[PDB]
Amino acid sequence: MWFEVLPGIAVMGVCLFIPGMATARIHRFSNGGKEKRVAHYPYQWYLMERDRRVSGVNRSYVSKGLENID
Amino acid sequence: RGEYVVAKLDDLINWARRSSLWPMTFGLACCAVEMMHMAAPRYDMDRFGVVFRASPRQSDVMIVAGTLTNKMAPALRKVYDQMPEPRYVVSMGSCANGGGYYHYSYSVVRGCDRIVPVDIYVPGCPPTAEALLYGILQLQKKIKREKRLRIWYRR
Amino acid sequence: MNLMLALLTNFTLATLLVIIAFWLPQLNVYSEKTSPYECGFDPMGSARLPFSMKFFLVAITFLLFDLEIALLLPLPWASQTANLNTMLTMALFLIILLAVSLAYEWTQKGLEWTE
Amino acid sequence: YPTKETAHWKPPPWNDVDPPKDTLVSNLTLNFGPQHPAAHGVLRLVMELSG
Amino acid sequence: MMLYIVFILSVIFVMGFVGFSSKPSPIYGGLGLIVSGGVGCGIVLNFGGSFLGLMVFLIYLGGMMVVFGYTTAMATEQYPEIWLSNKAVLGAFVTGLLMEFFMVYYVLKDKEVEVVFEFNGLGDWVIYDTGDSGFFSEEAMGIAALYSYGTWLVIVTGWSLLIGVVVIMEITRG
Amino acid sequence: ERVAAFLKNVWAKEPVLVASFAIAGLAVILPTLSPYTKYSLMINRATPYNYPVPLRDDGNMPDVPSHPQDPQGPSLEWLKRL
Amino acid sequence: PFFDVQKRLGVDLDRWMTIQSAEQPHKIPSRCHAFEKEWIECAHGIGSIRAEKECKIEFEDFRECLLRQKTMKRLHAIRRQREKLIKEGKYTPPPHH
Amino acid sequence: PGIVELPSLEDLKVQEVKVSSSVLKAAAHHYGAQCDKPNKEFMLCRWEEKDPRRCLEEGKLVNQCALEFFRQIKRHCAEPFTEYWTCIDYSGLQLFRRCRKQQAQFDECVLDKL
Amino acid sequence: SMMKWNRERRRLQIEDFEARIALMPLLQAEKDRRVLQMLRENLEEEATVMKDVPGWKVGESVFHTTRWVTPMMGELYGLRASEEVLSATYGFIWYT
Amino acid sequence: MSMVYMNIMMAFTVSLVGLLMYRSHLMSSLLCLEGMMLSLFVMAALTILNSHFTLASMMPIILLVFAACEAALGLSLLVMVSNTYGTDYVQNLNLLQC
Amino acid sequence: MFMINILMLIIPILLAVAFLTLVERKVLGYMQLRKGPNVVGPYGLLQPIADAIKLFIKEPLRPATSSASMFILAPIMALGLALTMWIPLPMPYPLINMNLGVLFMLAMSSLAVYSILWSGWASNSKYALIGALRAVAQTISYEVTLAIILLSVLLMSGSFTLSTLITTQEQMWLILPAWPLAMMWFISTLAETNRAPFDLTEGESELVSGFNVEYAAGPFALFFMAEYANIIMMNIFTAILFLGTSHNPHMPELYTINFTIKSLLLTMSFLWIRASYPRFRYDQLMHLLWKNFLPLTLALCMWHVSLPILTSGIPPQT
Ligand SMILES: CCCCCCCCCCCCCCCCCC(=O)OC[C@H](COP(=O)([O-])OCC[N+](C)(C)C)OC(=O)CCCCCCCCCCCCCCCCC
Ligand SMILES: CCCCCCCCCCCCO[C@@H]1O[C@H](CO)[C@@H](O[C@H]2O[C@H](CO)[C@@H](O)[C@H](O)[C@H]2O)[C@H](O)[C@H]1O
Ligand SMILES: CCCCCCCCCCCCO[C@@H]1O[C@H](CO)[C@@H](O[C@H]2O[C@H](CO)[C@@H](O)[C@H](O)[C@H]2O)[C@H](O)[C@H]1O
Ligand SMILES: CCCCCCCCCCCCO[C@@H]1O[C@H](CO)[C@@H](O[C@H]2O[C@H](CO)[C@@H](O)[C@H](O)[C@H]2O)[C@H](O)[C@H]1O
Ligand code: SF4
Secondary structure (H helix, E strand, C coil): HHHHHHHHHHHHHHHHHHHHHHHHHHHHHHHCCCCCCCCCEEEHHHHHHHHHHHHHHCCCCCCHHHHCCC | HHHHHHHHHHHHHHHHHHHHCCCCECCCCCHHHHHHHCCCCCCHHHHCCCCCCCHHCCCEEEEEEEECCCCHHHHHHHHHHHHCCCCCEEEEEEHHCCCHHHHHCCCCCCCCHHCCCCCCCCCCCCCCCHHHHHHHHHHHHHHHHCCCHHHHHCC | HHHHHHHHHHHHHHHHHHHHHHHCCCCCCCCCCCCCCCCCCCCCCCCCCCCCCCCCHHHHHHHHHHHHHHHHHHHHHCCCCCHHHHHHHHHHHHHHHHHHHHHHHHCCCCCCCCC | CCCCHHHHCCCCCCCCCCCCCCCCCEEEEEEECCCCCCCCCCCEEEEEEEC | CHHHHHHHHHHHHHHHHHHHHHCCHHHHHHHHHHHHHHHHHHHHHHCCHEEEHHHHHHHHHHHHHHHHHHHHHHHHCCCCCCCCCCCHHHHHHHHHHHHHHHHHHHHHHHHHECCCCEEEEECHHHCCCCCCCCCCCHHHHHHHHHHHCCCCHHHHHHHHHHHHHHHHHHHHCC | CCHHHHHHHHHCCCCHHHHHHHHHHHHHHHHHCCCCCCHHHHHHHHHHCCCCCCCCCCCCCCCCCCCCCCCCCCCCHHHHCC | CCCCHHHHCCCCHHHHHCCCCCCCCCHCCCCHHHHHHHHHHHHHCCCHHHHHHHCCCHHHHHHHHHHHHHHHHHHHHHHHHHHHHCCCCCCCCCCCC | CCCCCCCCCCCCCCCCCCCCCHHHCCCCHHHHHHHEEEEHHHHHHHHHCCCHHHHHHHHHHHHHHHHHHHHHHHHHHHHHHHHHHHCCCHHHCCCHHCCHHHHHHHHHHHHCCC | CHHHHHHHHHHHHHHHHHHHHHHHHHHHHHHHHHHHHHHHHHHHHHHHCCCEEEEEEEECCCCCCCCCCCCCCHHHCCCCHHHHHHHHHHHCCCCC | CCCCHHHHHHHHHHHHHHHHHCCHHHHHHHHHHHHHHHHHHHHHHHHHHHHHHHHHHHHHHHHHHHHHHHHHHHHHHHHHHHHHHHCEEEEHCHHHHC | CHHHHHHHHHHHHHHHEEEEEHHHHHHHHCCCCCCCCCCHHHHHHHHHHHHHHHHHHHCCCCCCCCCCHHHHHHHHHHHHHHHHHCCCCCCCCCCCCCHHHHHHHHHHHHHHHHHHHHHHHHHHHHHHHHHHHHHHHHHHHHHHHHHHHHHHHHHHHHCCCHHHHHCCCCCCCCCCCCCHHHHHHHHHHHCCCCCCCCCCCCHHHHCCHHCCCCCCCCHHHHHHHHHHHHHHHHHHHHHHHHHCCCCCCCCCHHHHHHHHHHHHHHHHHHHHHHHHHCCCHHHHHHHHHHHHHHHHHHHHHHHHHHHHHHHHCCCCCC
16 A cells, blocks of 8 residues: 555655754754854854954854953 | 674675566567566566666566577577676576477577576466566575575685 | 865765775676677677767857856846846846847757757 | 979869768667667667767 | 965866867867866865856856767767877877976975966965955955946847857858 | 737747746836835945945034934935835 | 047946956955055056156055065065074974964 | 064053954944944044054054943843843854844843943 | 845845944954054064074065055964964865 | 966966867867866956956956857857868868968 | 764765665555565565665676776766765755855756766767767756756845755745746756656666666666765755745754655655656757747746846845
């Protein structure tokens, strides 16, 4: 019966779901729990590079808030 | 243990080869009509993993389905030679088996096994589609018995 | 770096699959096996002989049309211009001349293959 | 001024048309079958093709 | 080593040029032009022109597809020549590589080289701009201006492409 | 009458080309009739890709604001209502 | 131009793209904008024969901006003198460098 | 052709505004209004003078106003602001439209208190 | 539907662009000090490396004009680790 | 100049020599013409991109457009040459010595 | 951590490709009143594994007349480029975020054609050559229309960035304002992927196997894996272009599920179409695109330039 085609579809579906889920979770793991910063334009790269210096640990994704202004 | 490993590796390659048999799209005469009926929905040879492919480079089995004449003999041997190995030949029907109704003709090869080695002989004129399927399953069980790695280990 | 690493990984994965494909299986090479395929009989003439192209004129037109899209692909950016009166006129002008050239080649039977 | 290196030069055609070369552009010949899905397995259709 | 990325790609650029300039079978010449077009796209992209680099690659891929078709129709022989098959082709090929290899060897050794004219070999990054922080791509702004500033360019190019179709129809109507 | 006689014929024989010309005609024509076309250029002008360099107050620029929140200078109230 | 129809008709066909200090989209300046402006304004109206000598300073600076040959010569010299002292054990770069 | 006059490392010293771009973006609109005067005096100087060396003093007043501006937020609206820029920082594009709720809380806080 | 959504997307782009305009003065002031600091450091370590050279004068301009000229990449990062040079030259282009 | 210019100028020269030193196939020489234009595109793009000549960024695109018109023109003549002689050999085009 | 991400992209791609072969044979089978593979593993679930092992232990052949280097190169290019097509795909986050992702995909699709041309030519056999030259005609047929179809859609998105298409379609699928383009795009992807009714470069019933007739075992498998990978990738591209999935930044896996379902169904549609129609003649394919899609695509391109300007709905550049 036609529903016996479903098992192969589900296997195909799980495999195709993995790359999207993996990319999203590796981005959070590698960027301190947040989305990876997107820098399509030089301004965005400039700010990200400034965040690297500001972090004090050479990571553009370590944020500094009010506690860093005396 | 080396023997245990090569025994299990033989099972894997034997399983893979018999589970995925691709006959060459090669038919000669009436017997090819029953071969067509094996692909048809009632028997659905595809459900065993048996898929026709036109190119000899992508074929694992030659089903000689019909009379082989002298004029055709060099062509059949050519496409057999052009199959990569391992390769198998199934002889289908009396004509291919030994000449059949035309055994005494001046223009007929008295059995395709004068031209190519044959693994399975399917009798009938024509064999029913089910009889040919029985012959293919017999070919599978022959492949399952192969001991290439076991013999290599003991060389 | 990420881009070069991704390309290297893909084409290395493909190369490894070919290396395994050639070195793992048992081979048995002889002349008849490796002969060119032509449905059981030996080929008549080299496969390197000239092969007439009946769509040769469409093929040349493709070159001209394939450069038009290079001129058109900037249109999403050109639409951000403040001078939208000029931009819209020149965008429509370019596409119409492409249509006129197509209509000319069509009416002159350039799109029919040589028989 | 005739010279040895131009002894083989002929005046051009009166109307600028040189005769068409007798060169033969050979048609490609193809074995269509017998082993072919559309040849019913036993037809050796020898076809001359231009393209 | 990565700081010399443009140099490395430019070396492959020349190697592809030596490829098709030695003139083997046009099948392999087209291959050499595709490699050069590919790395050429990489060179221009590394100077901030992503759109220019991808466009030249896209155009030349389409062009070499047509050349391939025309080659099998009008520029083929029984034994198409690879670079090793012909003595003239091999000599040009080897000569190109040796001239290239010696320019590379000496420009790297001295961080400079005189090949007719003087070229500095400090690495190509040294000339780059130091202060970018706009919210747009300058190459995209310049290219998009074709439709506002380049009215005259649009007219002459558009007209030439239309005439081009008219002309190739005339030229090939025996 | 010939307006409909010709159109009906092409509708029957080449509806693809009839649709193509009708769509192309609307592209050329509607932009000159639309009342919303004028805002396309205003929105493109109101987009500030560049810094707005201040002017040296020389003592007589009433139309220019001293602070970004002063009543002078262009406003985008029309844009909030679009 | 051999025939200056652009001037006669007051139509701009191509001179908008002749120089890099002309009006650019969104007022993006070229890297050598100041240098070329200074050269163009120095040589304006006096003719090439005079401009070749009387605006030599402006043109040389503009050429240096364009190709940076003198800067690259200078940096090539400093980098060479550093490797001379590194191998001879006569200089340690600072931490910040 | 001359020695390039550079300010000494001592002259280039100022207390930096060491916060991340998400913090700067979250406070940008209010910062644009509160620190307009020194900011626009620095930008007039840079564009007229065309020399970073000729606007260092104006640059420091930009920094000093920034620190004063951020100290007011810290004193009066620390928690509402920390929530707001934390929301901005999550986004890969740092989009305003994903944090209108936290923005409203921050906006009303600074309005009431300052 | 697309008309309304693209209008709102344009109003969002303006808000995003204006936040940048608010911060540009501070970013510009930071960039000027950083550039001048890097150039000053380059000058300190030019003197030591090139003290012994016969005809050298430290910090000499290549330009006849005394006008401020924006340094090129080699001028600013000329004597620094490749990691910092590679990030400053190709970091943006190579970022995914 | 910068070292990239050494290889781009070299690539142009290689293709120019390739163009001027014919063999038999006319298609091979047309390829050398296309290669010459590719080096000019890259060489022009580098200059324009590095100098931030914003409006010149369209110039390389215009260069490609007339490159295709030349290639299409070259291929059109190759078709006629091939039709006449059955090869694209350039030694067949020697009728006009006389 | 980036290398791990690469592997978590291409290992699943190849597994999905393997089980797409099973799904096709079952879907075709039931549409043909039969079952398809149901013996090798339960419901045929081990059948792709058997075929893969079979081919890679099969003897690979280098034809006597073939050009050796190009013969090997072409299958490597085919699979390598097929995997490269996936790196800018936002699912919802791309592996590589590109400003001009669409243009990158166009360029890489053009380069993948050369794996057909060179394999066919390097085989030095007549059916292989005929297959390769059919690929030249196929590319000439669809490539110009394919690019201009994308352009018309991107005039609503405002950028060449694949992730922007998600933002563009947050309120409504682009299939609504551009279903004529979706129609023509969908057909163009069948031609682009050499899929029925445009399976001409292989054309089994005509050319035996066309461009890959001389390929066996592992080298042949590379071509099969490439084509089936491109079929899935082009339907993901179609889903992003026209059936944009909403993206919640805090629950990115809801996007992935919804987007994966859409891409699967579009892939099932490819198999469905294969089961339903006869094959085109390859000159009739060229006339389909040039005489029908191109005149309409040019007209719609004019319309989609004017429409944003006349409705004051031009999208943001960023
Ligand atoms: C998506 C990719 C899918 C890849 C699938 C990979 C297949 C996975 C299953 C592997 C099963 C094990 C391989 C057995 C098949 C070997 C083919 C065969 O039947 O030969 C029979 C032959 C039989 O030889 P024979 O000696 O008995 O007789 C042949 C000689 N005449 C003709 C005279 C009789 O077996 C062998 O020769 C050796 C068997 C060794 C088995 C172990 C294999 C080791 C692999 C290393 C090979 C070296 C090259 C490196 C390749 C890369 C390594 C991974
Ligand atoms: C073979 C040659 C073919 C050549 C074909 C040329 C067709 C050109 C048709 C006209 C295209 C532009 O049409 C014209 O667009 C501009 C803006 O875009 C419109 O202008 C309208 O919007 C702009 C701003 O967007 C306002 O400045 C203007 O006040 C307003 O009227 C015109 O009202 C319209 O007439
Ligand atoms: C602005 C872009 C949109 C506008 C459309 C632009 C493209 C216009 C295409 C050509 C239009 C006229 O040119 C074309 O002439 C030929 C005559 O041989 C006609 O073609 C004729 O023979 C061919 C082949 O049998 C078929 O298309 C058709 O059966 C018949 O009409 C076309 O019907 C007509 O369309
Ligand atoms: C198909 C064939 C393709 C052929 C491709 C040919 C590519 C051309 C080769 C270019 C090699 C460039 O080589 C590059 O030279 C510079 C020299 O400063 C080296 O850079 C060097 O700089 C500093 C100097 O202070 C050293 O301390 C450092 O150890 C070293 O890396 C790079 O480490 C090297 O990678
Ligand atoms: S064996 Fe019988 S059925 Fe088969 S081909 Fe011969 S005569 Fe026909």
